[PDB]
Design a protein around this ligand. Structure first.
Ligand SMILES: O=C(O)c1ccc2[nH]c(=O)[nH]c(=O)c2c1
Ligand SMILES: O=C(O)c1ccc2[nH]c(=O)[nH]c(=O)c2c1
Ligand SMILES: O=C(O)c1ccc2[nH]c(=O)[nH]c(=O)c2c1
Ligand SMILES: O=C(O)c1ccc2[nH]c(=O)[nH]c(=O)c2c1
Ligand SMILES: O=C(O)c1ccc2[nH]c(=O)[nH]c(=O)c2c1
Lengths: 280, 279, 273, 278, 273
């Protein structure tokens, strides 16, 4: 509302799944006109690029053009690409820019070190988000850089709140957030596929089983978000004595279900830390 | 702009699912709380204490609920159902729609007990879940022998106000129980574990719970709004060599998918057992 | 166009058989050299019509496109043997797993500047013209070099250009993939035999099943999970079998395999460098 | 080809298998799409939409499919078969060849139900799979008590147009179900996982899927065109100390082979159960 | 002495090849009958010099010792086909797994009293004269019948008489044993290849290792655990490898195998009876 009237220009360096998801989310939110977004990519024959083209997002092979168009500039490329990108358009970053890095593991310090060689006070924000911004139910955290104004963090929270949950964190939490909510949707998609397989095994049509499993997970997550109760307490409320649910919970426990999800968060976090160590 | 002006709803049993439906129904604005009555043997229940605050009428006597109500939800444990039907069978009238939410309990068994008192009882079997309390439930129903077409349409309209609702053949309901009946508990277990993972890697517990729940909510919503297979949506998250595909490997190495299949199967089989013992 | 092979083991035979079955090369325009002129793969190229020789230098002098079909540990010795013989006309195509374009160009540049080098990763089903091939172009490979290589290798299966840093991963997937499939086919046949089928029939049916599913996926726009959903009737035989695969961590074993083959390929080159 | 000259085909059931066979048949040029009729209890399915696109005639009444068909494919679940035989049984004539594709359902059970209407029903039992849609199916069939010599011949020619087809004794069919009936789902599972492995090691998903499918297709063709044992072909692929033999070890360490045996066995046993129940 | 085979699959070929290699029977004094006169095992007996025929009755009329080398589910049909043709002179030797002497004698006694029946459990290495055979004598088998059978089958490997109730267990051990060994040899060769040996050499060395160890044990009075102790030098390579076998439950897998083959053999006969 107030952000739409700001008439912001947004740029994405990188035109893959995350850039498409955010562009789709921002336009569905009405905070940005699609034609006020510009995206660049070295490979213009990607499917995500054609989807962005149909939305009306401006597309170019030239990262400099994205930079010059943009007020808020998202870096949506892989971690090992970031230093080459900063070398290439570092001279084109202006005082008016806010540079938002979405690269997993890449530290504000490494970005500011590159950019400060060109102009002395680059405004940098580090972001970690996920694909459900496309349905305006993302989970986003951000940390502000050395030179990011207080108004810069409030602007970014306003923008990212339009497509889901958003909150400021200290940067040292972001690798862990990556393993939880960055990778989280993929754990859920895996779980939903498996639950549907279970529904089909027990005689449900696939379409119904997918719908029911997804509705179950959505409702449960919303319950927890609207409850101040522990998830174990909500689990207890579901499970009647001797009943169907408690029998199913036992077979999950017998396979170490809980430990697998802990293993997943840890593995994603650890990999995020070693992608940056390979950079560093 | 739905509102059932001439419908009175009663709950026999005042436990978790009764409160959840009454809360969902009232939050939806389709029923005034004062047109809902609930009966319970343990009037010191925490759920029976909350229903009073909403304005739901409470009574200790199942006969009062039956006499007050047109739509009668049977929200009791499965083994109590034949004792309930023995109690109020002679009080069932033509106007009544009896909606059983008892897991596993067949329409045939309910109709056989009620038909000893008055022929043609109108019976609908329901399987729903606790997220109706936030109007995001997953409900299926099957109509009995003597249920009229308007009965099912009315129940679907009512249960659609608190989440997804669709008609199914009765022999699918034990499997629905294993999937969406028990599913929220699988999700609560997963969210506790994901939060433990976040805490292990250094996040505060409160933030970890919030992020994990938001992640699951968003992913579920994506799937419901997409025509794409969940495997395609999974593919879009995982960048080559990246954090997510490394985490997906450790889920696979533990047989994560098989445990969720095991769970649906175990809940379904137990539902079939509970009934085969009722017979 | 004349083609030569340094090395005459399994992969050299598979390419030459595929190329000539494709009609893109005449067998008499192909030359192959081997140290052990007693390998069974050597006698097969003989019956095929390929010109044979023990001298690596003869192959170089007779061919324009030069395939290096030797084990990765022998490439430096081959380059040191023939490096003085490479000319402006030669396109050197290394099929050795792990071996970098950099390492080939370094050895050859000591003899003549700007060697034209291509790195290729292919697999044995080129012998039935259904291989899977990727290639990366070297520093001095001209534009027509890559296009020529794609034209040649597309005649024996799928072929596409990649950045060289993907090739070790390709090795773990389609380079080693046929071996995973042969293992799977042996095991599926054992399962058919356990359940009462004659071995010959069980082999034929399992192989046909795998061929048809692979073709379905290549010819469909749909995700393999969606095609899986279409096979599995509710409550049926297939979804019961898929559960027992999942319970054993079937998917993770295949991920483990691609990872292990890729990592070993990286080790083999690190030991070379 | 004079077998298929004036032949009309009907599918009772409009699910995934009826669609796959109708697509395969029309793609093969054996039958014309308009000469094919299908019936379903729910004309609002996903597959019934595609069949309408192809030009196949659709109806909600199975009696209409029977009266319009020479070769009648029963493409429904095994528990529905006795209900369908009760429904259309009085309409089966001496001209009809009844082809059951239901898993586990025995020729004897079908003949018993149809013999109450007319005494010599011509029955064939079939087990095929979804890759008939690209004419690379794997099909077996067994002929019933009253199937004429030309009947199995016609069936052989029809199903060979869409892939491999051979006659078997009926007592092998449950085992074939576990192997080539369910087989494609094992392959799709394996291809999804192999692509995940490629992605973990840095490949784009689209490329990883293409390479994995091509690897599987090429290996399968190699074995079909070779007289050699699959273990021999495996040995030819594995260079000493190399990448492939290292990957084969980790497959062996997880019992990869036993999982595929388990799968064939579980599918076969479920097929026997579905019949022993119904 | 004239010998016949009803059945001409793997086991019939192995016995006939072993017998004639042993010099105890002339190939022209051997007759074999099969329904599928197109099996590869049938053409091998042809090249060997064995007289072939499709008619089970011809084999019976031409031979004195009559081997039943058919699958266990076909024995009753064979007995019903030829039972009227058995005479005083015939010794009927059933090699079908699980099939009891009782069931054979019951079917044959309906035609002529006192049929002379032997039950045998052998294995494929009779083809190289290193088989393992046990036999049990029937109710009406004379004393010279057992001694003759031991003389014949000792020419193609180890042979001893047993009580019939041990034969299902023997089936699980030496009947199925060669298959366990072939599996073990394939896996040991894979291990040699992983560690850098060429496949042909790894197969030869692994097979020689197994042959020599088996011969050591047969020729020694010592317990296999004691011979194991003699191989394993303290701190050495062998004792490290034995630990990893133990950690995987190697011994229990072999016990599982003998048990599973024995139990299945009992099931197959229970289904027959
Ligand atoms: O590589 C991955 O698995 C992955 C997952 C989520 C992510 N979310 C985000 O905001 N930036 C990222 O790079 C990102 C990467
Ligand atoms: O025992 C349980 O865990 C359980 C779970 C979900 C349920 N949903 C419903 O509608 N009625 C029920 O009894 C029910 C019971
Ligand atoms: O040793 C191996 O496991 C192996 C497998 C496939 C290969 N394909 C190719 O093109 N060059 C290679 O060296 C190669 C090696
Ligand atoms: O139950 C199943 O999963 C299944 C799988 C493959 C099949 N192929 C066929 O031809 N008829 C079938 O019923 C069939 C059923
Ligand atoms: O089917 C089997 O696994 C098997 C193995 C060994 C055998 N040895 C013998 O003498 N008669 C048999 O039937 C036999 C059967």
């Amino acid at each position: 509302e107030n952000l739409y009237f700001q008439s912001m220009s947004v740029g994405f360096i990188g035109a893959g799944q995350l850039a498409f998801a955010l562009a789709k989310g921002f336009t569905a939110a009405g905070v940005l006109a699609a034609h006020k977004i510009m995206a660049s990519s070295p490979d213009m024959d990607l499917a995500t690029v054609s989807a962005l083209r149909k939305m009306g997002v401006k597309l170019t092979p030239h990262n400099k053009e994205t930079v010059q168009h943009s007020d808020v500039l998202f870096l949506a490329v892989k971690p090992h690409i970031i230093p080459f990108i900063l070398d290439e358009i570092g001279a084109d970053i202006e005082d008016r820019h806010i540079v938002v890095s979405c690269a997993a593991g890449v530290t504000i310090s490494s970005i500011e070190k590159k950019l400060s060689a060109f102009r002395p006070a680059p405004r940098v924000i580090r972001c970690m988000t996920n694909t459900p911004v496309v349905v305006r139910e993302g989970a986003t955290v951000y940390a502000t850089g050395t030179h990011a104004q207080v108004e810069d963090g409030r602007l970014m929270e306003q923008l990212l709140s339009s497509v889901g949950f958003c909150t400021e964190v200290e940067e040292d939490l972001i690798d862990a957030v990556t393993g939880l909510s960055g990778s989280g949707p993929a754990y859920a998609f895996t779980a939903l596929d498996a639950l549907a397989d279970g529904g089909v095994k027990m005689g449900l049509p696939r379409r119904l089983a997918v719908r029911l499993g997804a509705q179950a997970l959505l409702g449960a997550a919303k319950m927890l978000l609207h409850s101040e109760q522990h998830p174990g307490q909500l689990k207890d409320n579901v499970s009647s004595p001797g009943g169907a649910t408690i029998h199913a919970l036992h077979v999950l426990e017998s396979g170490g279900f809980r430990s697998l999800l802990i293993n997943a968060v840890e593995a994603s976090c650890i990999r995020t830390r070693e992608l940056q160590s390979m950079a560093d």
